[PDB]
Amino acid sequence: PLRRISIKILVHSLFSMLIMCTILTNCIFMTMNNPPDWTKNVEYTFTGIYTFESLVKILARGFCVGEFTFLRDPWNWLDFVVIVFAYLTEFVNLGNVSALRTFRVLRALKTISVIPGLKTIVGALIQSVKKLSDVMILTVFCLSVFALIGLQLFMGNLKHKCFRNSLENNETLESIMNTLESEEDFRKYFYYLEGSKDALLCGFSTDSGQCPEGYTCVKIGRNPDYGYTSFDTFSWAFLALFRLMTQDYWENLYQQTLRAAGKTYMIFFVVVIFLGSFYLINLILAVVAMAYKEQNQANIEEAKCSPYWIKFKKCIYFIVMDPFVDLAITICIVLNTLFMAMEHHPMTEEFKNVLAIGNLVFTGIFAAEMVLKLIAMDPYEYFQVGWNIFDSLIVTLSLVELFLLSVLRSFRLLRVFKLAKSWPTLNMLIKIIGNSVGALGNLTLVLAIIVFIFAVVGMQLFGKSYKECVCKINDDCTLPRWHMNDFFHSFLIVFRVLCGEWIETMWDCMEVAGQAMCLIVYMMVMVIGNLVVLNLFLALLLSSFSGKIWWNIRKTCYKIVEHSWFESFIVLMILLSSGALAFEDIYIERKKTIKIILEYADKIFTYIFILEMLLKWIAYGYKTYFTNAWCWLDFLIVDVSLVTLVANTLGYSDLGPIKSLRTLRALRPLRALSRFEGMRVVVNALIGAIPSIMNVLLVCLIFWLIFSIMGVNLFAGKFYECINTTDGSRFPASQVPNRSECFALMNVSQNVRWKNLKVNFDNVGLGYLSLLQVATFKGWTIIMYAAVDSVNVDKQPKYEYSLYMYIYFVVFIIFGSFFTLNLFIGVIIDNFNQQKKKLGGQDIFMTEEQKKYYNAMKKLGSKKPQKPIPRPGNKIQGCIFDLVTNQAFDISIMVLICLNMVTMMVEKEGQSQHMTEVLYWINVVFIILFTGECVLKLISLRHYYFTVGWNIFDFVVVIISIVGMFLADLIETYFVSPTLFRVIRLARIGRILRLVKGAKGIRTLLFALMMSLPALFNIGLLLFLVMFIYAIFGMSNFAYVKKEDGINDMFNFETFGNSMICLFQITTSAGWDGLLAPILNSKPPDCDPKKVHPGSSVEGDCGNPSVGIFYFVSYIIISFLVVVNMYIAVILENFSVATE
Amino acid sequence: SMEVTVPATLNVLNGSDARLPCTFNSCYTVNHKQFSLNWTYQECNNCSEEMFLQFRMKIINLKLERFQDRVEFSGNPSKYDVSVMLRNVQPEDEGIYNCYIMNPPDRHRGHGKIHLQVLM
Amino acid sequence: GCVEVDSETEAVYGMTFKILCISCKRRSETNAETFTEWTFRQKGTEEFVKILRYENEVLQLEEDERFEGRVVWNGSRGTKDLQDLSIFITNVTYNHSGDYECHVYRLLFFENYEHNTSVVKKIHIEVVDKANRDMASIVSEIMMYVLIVVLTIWLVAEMIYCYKKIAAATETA
Ligand SMILES: *[C@@H]1O[C@H](CO)[C@@H](O[C@@H]2O[C@H](CO)[C@@H](O)[C@H](O)[C@H]2NC(C)=O)[C@H](O)[C@H]1NC(C)=O
Ligand SMILES: *[C@@H]1O[C@H](CO)[C@@H](O[C@@H]2O[C@H](CO)[C@@H](O)[C@H](O)[C@H]2NC(C)=O)[C@H](O)[C@H]1NC(C)=O
Ligand SMILES: NC1=N[C@H](O)[C@H]2[C@H]3O[C@]4(O)O[C@@H]([C@@H](O)[C@@]2(N1)[C@@H]4O)[C@]3(O)CO
Ligand SMILES: *[C@@H]1O[C@H](CO)[C@@H](O)[C@H](O)[C@H]1NC(C)=O
Ligand SMILES: *[C@@H]1O[C@H](CO)[C@@H](O)[C@H](O)[C@H]1NC(C)=O
Ligand SMILES: *[C@@H]1O[C@H](CO)[C@@H](O)[C@H](O)[C@H]1NC(C)=O
Ligand SMILES: *[C@@H]1O[C@H](CO)[C@@H](O)[C@H](O)[C@H]1NC(C)=O
Ligand SMILES: *[C@@H]1O[C@H](CO)[C@@H](O)[C@H](O)[C@H]1NC(C)=O
Ligand SMILES: *[C@@H]1O[C@H](CO)[C@@H](O)[C@H](O)[C@H]1NC(C)=O
Ligand SMILES: *[C@@H]1O[C@H](CO)[C@@H](O)[C@H](O)[C@H]1NC(C)=O
């Protein structure tokens, strides 16, 4: 009877709803962070409902039969535990109260079970991880190898600091160290770069450096970043490398190592970033995407008076003139938006008034129309249409403020959307958005649930610590901008980590909360959180997606142009011509002799190219010559060079634009594009997709325009602040509250300045720029601090007065970056797919010769058995041979290598002499055992041993290992090169590579990369040329700019070596905002317009704001386009290898 | 309150050495000028406190007549340790021993209290 | 920014000449105060005599007649941290010939460190009656023409060999 009642209670429509409603309510409570005492009773109520729900489930299912029905399901175990802890919490409990609360957090999890289909969705995500397991081993192995290389090459390098040469009192460096721990104290002794957290990193070599005179370089003390950033230990090196792989603030690490190590080591980063980061991340996407398709597709496959009033009605419905009126309205609306776009920080009253009038006419036109539609269709008929329901709200909102908040207005911008029906792409952007809350609504909901659990979990665990420690992460002992104290704040940090920004915050969590706790939480958010985000992106994208002597002469010239020596000779000139470009830099003045030959050398080049062009005309004729895209490119370049030569040669000329024309000389490397088959092929692929790329840019601009317009209304003119010029610190606002007040201070004070941000929302164009930085995630934080801080147009900004403005940025990132990028990626890859289909289903990134080679590599995939080999006649051969073929022998050797690898890991900076000797001896045994194995295989195998490819690699490794060993030893007896010695020991890492043979799973993944090397090479060549043209433009244009942020000695545009280093960093798009910052400032007091520049003729270091913006922005976009290509090339090959 | 770990009761035989062990724990790194530790003795619960050892830049042993020269510092404060040693304990040493630790920048002041009892 | 460039070693008689001494700080950010001394010993003579001292903003030039009245300063102006020290002579004369040594004194201000440094730059100049083109400049000009002639010659020779062959082919069919 009771069981029937309970069972009756258990399955009911209301009960599932009741259990769920209480749970949602509890979540709001967790968010309290210091709930009042009275709330405790509420806590009691939540506990009771949980027990009650559990009892019915347990009472009915069990039948006092051990709760067999109840505990059989996996989900309930989680449910059972939550009630108990509360009983237990009341019962004697463990010491950690902060720790205690986190357990309750699982109640929120209970929600997964209560909602319909969440159970199905989460299981699918977990099913996804099983596929991801193999990539994970490889990532660990790959990260591990680089970590070993990084540790051997850079250990102890981050330690360097400039140390003062003359010391009072006979003090020694060692004596000074134990005595001082104070921050002020560290500073007197070491250089410290003007308000930075830690001492300047110095270098031994000529390339790195440098310390000011009177300061010497010695290595002592903690690594920069609280000691967190160091290459000293394997664990620390591993963290540093993991950061590089996910590219979080990688720009900072690269800048630091390069400064200490020296620029020559830039090579390490290029290989790691290029193979380790671009490639590894791509592999994860392919596997997740590939895995998603099977499950998505596999599941899908299984399924398949009164009359007079009416008289007026004939007219309107006749007057709607749907052919002209509706069409007329959209054109009218676009016009209104343009009207809205006109805004500035400072506007005269007359302009402001027109805006008021223009808005009214527009308000008037739409309003007349709204009444008209309903009368024609009546309220039930009229209101039913979805767009109409949408429009009335728009009319309603406009009318409400017709004569009555600032926040309310900001919404007027939305109207612009109606344009979507006519446009094909607008349709695509809307369709993608619909899926997020439509079919994929359950999946999107999971992301929301996970973000919520983490924000609360982080808050419970580290909330108290941030408040108490503070001082361990600040000077004013006040909370930092990013912290975990409150739910909104805790939420922001979790949100930031979703974007790849975890390391900056993590160092701080660690200072207050300790290393073990902070590391575990952040690592989980990053791995688990990102997997869900990746799934949503990929899931969303895929679902959305689905005499006449003259004639003889003419013939002969044709013969000359066609001939190989000539084609070959011309190419040499192009490389040579391009190379001369590099030599011109700020240092061209020194080395006057090279300058003279280069100037003369160009003239010979100009003559050769002009001469070559004439041959082209005779051989091809004008019609053939000008119908070619490449020739026009060639003709334009010779002409610019020709004009400068005549003008230089003619003389007199050399004023103004003539000089400007000269800078176009940087464009010369461009001829080179036609000559190389690999480079040209990449271009064919890009031209094919520009039209497709073009439609999307327009949609983004429209989408971005609404955000930009919205942004302008909210923050236009509010970013100004009064700052102390010496340290750039905003005044309190207790004093100097408004701009008017700030000026009075200047009159009586020397260094106070009222100044704008430089990238802001003052106008729609600038808003477009500010938005781009936020979308990329680079330089965005400086702006947000400004947005939240802001109060009014002429008033000094209060700290975090807005606070919630962050919502504006969060919404833009989700819509502006997550959705559009989803759209950008979807169209580009698809367009690439169509191109492949057209050219007979062949890969589009390889030259014909490359294709033959690609096929040969395909052959290596086959497993046909090779000959076994014959057990020699002799017993020794038989005995020696019998052991080698045994299964145990390979496993024993394999285990041995792993043992060897662990030995390398134990090495750490500062290890004692005893440890060093043992490691040396232990290695020798391995050197002996490994050499021993090679000899044994050889005795039994004989000629057969050389047949296998792997055996040869194994044989080669031994020679390198022994040879590396002798050389290291030889160097010690006769030479003392520390840098040389480290490189030599690098030879051993070779043995570790042997681990690869044993693991079949990783071998397949590695092999796939090999397949795509030919395609990647062509893109790399094209990418290199573009980087080269930009470096040249940069050297002439940006050398001499004032050094501010991102531009300092090294990593500057002063010379070609330097320019290349910067361009490489910016290729990933990292710290792009930083380089652009010095270029933007123009006029006093930002910079001095006329500067001496000793050693040179040019005056001023003022960046060209217009030229600078085009240059950085164009580069960011171009590099991104090519990188999309790497993503495309890797995916194609990966599907093929896995597919086999 | 500050996390200070001491035995609430410490029972020691007359004539033996008594280490008074207390644990002080706070975030940050200890500063010599910044870190200050004070030890006081009372003959009884309501009895006046007599400071007998301080840390101010260094250890200061006040050499109270009631202890002769039997008090020694016995702890490395950088380790959060501020223990003291009372050599050759005498019956008159019975009473209450208080450790007060104030550590900049930590505003809070830790307090450990030990009841020392002398056996027979 | 600052670059170090060596001074010209040949000066035309009766014409203005500029001597370049440029010293660059290791780090641009650091700020220090500089002053300079230039000492010149006439050719065929031993030892040195200081000719000028430049400290603060005013330039003090030695009173001796050999250098009296014909020198101007081309150094950095108003910086007080010169970096570039250069001397310009108007009406160059034979008497202005020999070895020039320029020493620089720099006060670098650090957080609690004040550093005094000395760097010496030596320039030797010999006067000449008529300016002469440098060997690299003259040779390069001559070398350039030869290259142009060979290529032009190579193309013509190339056409001539090509033309006869092409013409011959026409006759056979
Ligand atoms: C702007 O900030 C500067 C830099 O701290 C302030 O200058 C300090 O002022 C105090 C008293 O005037 C001096 O004792 C310090 O030595 C100064 N610092 C240095 C190193 O110069 C200055 O007070 C601020 N400006 C105003 C107007 O308050
Ligand atoms: C800008 O801030 C100033 C500073 O408070 C305001 O002007 C006055 O400030 C003085 C102090 O010198 C007070 O005695 C006055 O009471 C302030 N004004 C008034 C009317 O009380 C000023 O009002 C602020 N707003 C402006 C100038 O736009
Ligand atoms: N991963 C990051 N990439 C950006 O290049 C970095 C720059 O920009 C940023 O906003 O602040 C600083 C740093 O935190 C950044 N973090 C933030 O994005 C920064 O160095 C200067 O602003
Ligand atoms: C410096 O040398 C003197 C010798 O006169 C010595 O007494 C003193 O201890 C030395 N200083 C230090 C800090 O050791
Ligand atoms: C500074 O104060 C004087 C009063 O002597 C005033 O004339 C001047 O306008 C003020 N400066 C500015 C920039 O307003
Ligand atoms: C001595 O102890 C008292 C506690 O009453 C404390 O306030 C004081 O700072 C201590 N003395 C020193 C020198 O630290
Ligand atoms: C060189 O000296 C002359 C004096 O005739 C002066 O006018 C000129 O400005 C100086 N050159 C520089 C670069 O200051
Ligand atoms: C050069 O010096 C001579 C004196 O020997 C003087 O007569 C002449 O005017 C000077 N040159 C110029 C251009 O003034
Ligand atoms: C030029 O030099 C000679 C010898 O060096 C000297 O006798 C003569 O006085 C100098 N000329 C002037 C104008 O001083
Ligand atoms: C260093 O400065 C002092 C000022 O006290 C000065 O006398 C001295 O000449 C300077 N050193 C050098 C090498 O110029």
Coordinates of N, CA, C and O in Angstrom, one line a residue, chain A residues 179-217:
Chain A
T179 N 71.3 38.9 3.6 CA 70.9 40.1 4.3 C 69.6 40.8 3.8 O 68.8 41.3 4.7
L180 N 69.3 40.9 2.5 CA 68.1 41.6 2.1 C 67.0 40.8 1.4 O 67.2 40.0 0.5
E181 N 65.8 41.0 2.0 CA 64.6 40.4 1.5 C 63.5 41.4 1.0 O 62.5 41.1 0.4
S182 N 63.7 42.6 1.5 CA 62.8 43.7 1.2 C 62.8 44.1 -0.3 O 63.8 44.1 -0.9
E183 N 61.6 44.5 -0.8 CA 61.5 44.9 -2.2 C 62.3 46.1 -2.5 O 62.9 46.2 -3.6
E184 N 62.2 47.1 -1.6 CA 63.0 48.3 -1.8 C 64.4 47.9 -1.8 O 65.2 48.5 -2.6
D185 N 64.8 47.0 -0.9 CA 66.2 46.6 -0.8 C 66.7 45.9 -2.0 O 67.8 46.1 -2.4
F186 N 65.9 45.1 -2.7 CA 66.3 44.4 -3.9 C 66.7 45.4 -4.9 O 67.6 45.2 -5.7
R187 N 65.9 46.4 -5.0 CA 66.0 47.5 -6.0 C 67.3 48.3 -6.0 O 67.9 48.6 -7.0
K188 N 67.8 48.7 -4.8 CA 69.1 49.5 -4.8 C 70.2 48.7 -5.4 O 71.0 49.3 -6.2
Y189 N 70.3 47.4 -5.1 CA 71.3 46.5 -5.6 C 71.4 46.1 -7.1 O 72.4 45.9 -7.6
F190 N 70.2 45.9 -7.6 CA 70.0 45.5 -9.0 C 69.3 46.5 -9.8 O 68.7 47.5 -9.3
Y191 N 69.3 46.4 -11.2 CA 68.8 47.5 -12.0 C 67.3 47.8 -11.9 O 66.9 49.0 -11.7
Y192 N 66.4 46.8 -12.1 CA 64.9 47.1 -12.0 C 64.4 48.1 -13.0 O 64.7 49.3 -12.8
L193 N 63.7 47.7 -14.0 CA 63.3 48.6 -15.1 C 62.1 49.5 -14.9 O 61.1 49.3 -15.4
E194 N 62.3 50.6 -14.1 CA 61.3 51.6 -13.9 C 59.9 51.3 -13.5 O 59.0 51.6 -14.2
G195 N 59.7 50.7 -12.3 CA 58.4 50.4 -11.8 C 57.9 49.0 -12.1 O 56.8 48.7 -11.8
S196 N 58.7 48.2 -12.8 CA 58.3 46.8 -13.1 C 58.5 46.0 -11.8 O 59.1 46.4 -10.9
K197 N 57.8 44.8 -11.8 CA 57.8 44.0 -10.7 C 59.2 43.4 -10.3 O 59.5 43.2 -9.1
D198 N 60.0 43.0 -11.3 CA 61.3 42.3 -11.1 C 62.4 42.9 -11.9 O 62.3 43.7 -12.8
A199 N 63.7 42.5 -11.5 CA 64.9 43.0 -12.1 C 65.0 42.7 -13.5 O 64.6 41.6 -14.0
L200 N 65.7 43.6 -14.3 CA 65.9 43.5 -15.7 C 66.7 42.3 -16.0 O 67.7 42.0 -15.3
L201 N 66.4 41.5 -17.1 CA 67.1 40.3 -17.5 C 68.2 40.8 -18.4 O 68.0 41.5 -19.3
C202 N 69.4 40.3 -18.1 CA 70.6 40.6 -18.8 C 71.2 39.4 -19.6 O 70.8 38.3 -19.3
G203 N 72.1 39.6 -20.5 CA 72.7 38.5 -21.2 C 74.2 38.6 -21.4 O 74.8 39.7 -21.6
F204 N 74.9 37.4 -21.4 CA 76.3 37.3 -21.7 C 76.8 37.6 -23.1 O 77.9 38.3 -23.3
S205 N 76.1 37.2 -24.1 CA 76.4 37.4 -25.5 C 76.2 38.8 -26.1 O 75.4 39.5 -25.5
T206 N 76.8 39.0 -27.2 CA 76.6 40.3 -27.9 C 75.2 40.5 -28.4 O 74.7 41.6 -28.3
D207 N 74.6 39.4 -28.9 CA 73.2 39.5 -29.4 C 72.1 39.8 -28.3 O 71.2 40.5 -28.6
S208 N 72.3 39.3 -27.1 CA 71.3 39.6 -26.1 C 71.6 40.8 -25.3 O 71.5 41.9 -25.9
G209 N 72.0 40.7 -24.1 CA 72.4 41.9 -23.3 C 71.1 42.7 -23.0 O 70.1 42.3 -23.3
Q210 N 71.3 43.9 -22.5 CA 72.6 44.5 -22.1 C 72.3 45.3 -20.8 O 71.2 45.6 -20.5
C211 N 73.4 45.5 -20.0 CA 73.2 46.2 -18.8 C 73.8 47.6 -18.9 O 74.8 47.8 -19.5
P212 N 73.2 48.6 -18.1 CA 73.8 49.9 -18.3 C 75.2 49.9 -17.7 O 75.6 49.1 -16.9
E213 N 76.0 50.9 -18.2 CA 77.4 50.9 -17.7 C 77.4 51.1 -16.2 O 76.5 51.8 -15.7
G214 N 78.3 50.5 -15.5 CA 78.4 50.6 -14.1 C 77.6 49.5 -13.4 O 77.5 49.4 -12.2
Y215 N 77.0 48.6 -14.2 CA 76.3 47.5 -13.7 C 76.8 46.2 -14.4 O 77.0 46.3 -15.6
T216 N 77.0 45.1 -13.7 CA 77.6 43.9 -14.4 C 76.6 42.8 -14.3 O 75.7 42.8 -13.4
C217 N 76.7 41.9 -15.2 CA 75.7 40.7 -15.2 C 76.2 39.5 -14.5 O 77.2 38.9 -14.8

